[PDB]
Structure formats: C-alpha cells, structure tokens
Swiss-Prot record:
Protein name: Ribonuclease H
CDD domains hit by this protein: H3TH_T4-like, PIN_53EXO-like
Catalytic activity: Endonucleolytic cleavage to 5'-phosphomonoester
Primary role: Plays essential roles in DNA replication by removing the RNA primers from lagging strand fragments. Exhibits 5'to 3' exonuclease activity on either RNA/DNA or DNA/DNA duplexes and endonuclease activity on either flap or fork DNA structures.
Listed GO biological process terms: DNA replication, Okazaki fragment processing; DNA replication, removal of RNA primer
Cited PANTHER family: 5'-3' EXONUCLEASE FAMILY PROTEIN (PTHR42646:SF2), FLAP ENDONUCLEASE XNI (PTHR42646)
Its EC number(s): 3.1.26.4
Record keywords: DNA replication, Endonuclease, Exonuclease, Hydrolase, Nuclease
Metal-binding listed as a keyword: no
Keyword Hydrolase recorded: yes
Gene: rnh
First-tier enzyme category under EC: hydrolase
Source taxon at top rank: Viruses
Organism, scientific name: Enterobacteria phage T4
Length: 284
C-alpha cells in the first residue's frame, strides 16, 4: 500500500552533533566523522522505523555553487576545525551513496530544506504518512499537509504548532537575518549593503497576522514598495513558491536513485574499520 516515509534534515543533524561532540581546537579526522555520522544514522533510522516510517531519505545541503534562490536574490545567504569536518563529511557522504540503503538527496545549489519541503508535499498528497526528523521551525509550513509529523532529534520531542502561517508570514514580512532575507520595510539586499546608521523599521504584529490570515491584505496594508518586497521574500521563505523546475528536478532525482544492495554494508563496515558495527547492520 503506502509505506511510511521519513525525511531527515541530515546536514543539520550531522553538523550540530559534530559541534557538540568534537571538542574545540582539536583537529577532526575522517574516522571521527565516520563514526559520528553512522551512529547518528543508526539512532535516527531506529526512531523512524519503530514509529512506522520504514523508508529513510537523507537530505543534504549542497552549496558548492551557491543556491538556486540566489538567481532571484544575489544576497541570499551571503575555534572549531570546520575544514576538517566538511572535508571528512563530504567523503563519508559519498560512502553513504555507495553502500548504505538510503536515498541521499544531494543536488548542487539545492538545500536540504528544498528536498524535504518538496518530497514531503509530494508523498503526503500521495497517501504516505510522513516523518520529518529535524528541529528547524521552518518545516512547520509542512504540517498543514495530512499525516505529517516532525521529530526533534536534539530535544527528543515532537514538534507541534494556524500558528505556522504567522511564523511563515513573520519571516516574509520582517525577514530572516540568518539567510540575509531582509524586511519589506527596507531594500532587498539590506543585510548585504547595510551601512551603520541603518536600522530596519518595525513591523506591527496586527499587520503581520492580518496578512497571515488573508494574504490579499498584502495589497491593502502594504505600500507598493513593501508589496514588491513581499513578493520577493515569498520565493525566499515560502516553500510553496519553490519554482516548478526546482521541485521537478528534486523529484526526478529521487525517482532516478538506485539503492545499493544491503550486501554492500557489511564489506564497507569492515573496510572502514568499523568491525564493532557489523553486528548492528540490522539496525541500519
Ligand atoms: Mg528557507
């Protein structure tokens, strides 16, 4: 019938785990990253499958050549051994593609949020029960779709939020500094070209919610300048505004993914000196 599908924001989980586990001012090698990633996978796949989500899809961030959203906004997204991590992680990722039984959504200029947002929408409407393994609040945009639950790996609690529309509209109107998305009250590339004497005019909550409940209010409550910014930020924030060609690519990639036979896992575990994991293959 319809298999339970679990979509994992892995790039976040792996890195976040690495930041917490790998001590500062200590170099990070390939094995350290390998152990961490595979253990992270084992722990999360077991949480998913136990709940009924038996198909696992690993979603990876890939900004080797930037982001597709940058085509719309150039400013988009413009001690610890970071080099050592990214270096080893990319190598372990390629290994997961070659031996592990998971579909690894990895497209250059594509975000993990893209793969999740698109695939969640696709398989949700297709009758599958979906599980999003991530703490990211942006994925509350996807809770509106039937049979969609979200599990926070770090806090080990369910993510349940109407309030999703307000959360989404808040970033659309006020912006999202972390991604260089600016408020509609200021110029598009504000965060990238901001001088010092510059601050962003505040956005009253009453308007944020009014537009949240009825987006046609974006025409009556926003000035023409702000409305133009509003439309721009839609493509940057709202998952629904992911271009058809982008989602089309994401889907095609998924459907064209060939999984490696499970016989590969064992020989790989040994090849990587993970002998004390071959007795846990059933957990992968
Ligand atoms: Mg986003």
């Amino acid at each position: 019938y319809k298999e339970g599908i679990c979509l994992i924001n892995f790039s976040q989980i792996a890195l976040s785990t690495a930041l917490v586990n790998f001590p500062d001012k200590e170099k990070i090698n390939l094995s350290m990253v390998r152990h961490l990633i595979l253990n992270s996978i084992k722990f999360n796949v077991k949480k998913a499958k136990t709940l009924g989500y038996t198909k696992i899809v690993l979603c990876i961030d890939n900004a080797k050549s930037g982001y597709w959203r940058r085509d719309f906004a150039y400013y988009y997204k413009k001690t610890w051994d970071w080099e050592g991590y990214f270096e080893s992680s990319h190598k372990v990722i390629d290994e997961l593609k070659a031996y592990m039984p998971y579909i690894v959504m990895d497209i250059d200029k594509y975000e993990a949020d893209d793969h999740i947002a698109v695939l969640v929408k696709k398989f949700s409407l297709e009758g599958h029960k979906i599980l999003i393994i991530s703490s990211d609040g942006d994925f509350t945009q996807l809770h509106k779709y039937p049979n969609v639950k979200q599990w926070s790996p770090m806090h080990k609690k369910w993510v349940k939020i109407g309030s999703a529309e307000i959360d989404c509209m808040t970033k659309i109107l006020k912006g999202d500094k972390k991604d260089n998305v600016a408020s509609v009250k200021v110029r598009s590339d504000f965060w990238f070209t901001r001088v010092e004497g510059e601050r962003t005019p505040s956005m009253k909550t009453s308007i944020v919610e009014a537009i949240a409940n009825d987006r046609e209010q974006a025409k009556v409550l926003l000035t023409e300048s702000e409305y133009n910014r509003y439309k721009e930020n839609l493509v940057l924030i709202d998952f629904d505004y992911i271009p058809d060609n982008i989602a089309s690519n994401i889907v095609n990639y998924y459907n064209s993914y060939k999984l490696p036979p499970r016989g590969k896992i064992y020989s790989y575990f040994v090849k990587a000196g993970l002998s004390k994991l071959t007795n846990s293959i059933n957990e992968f």
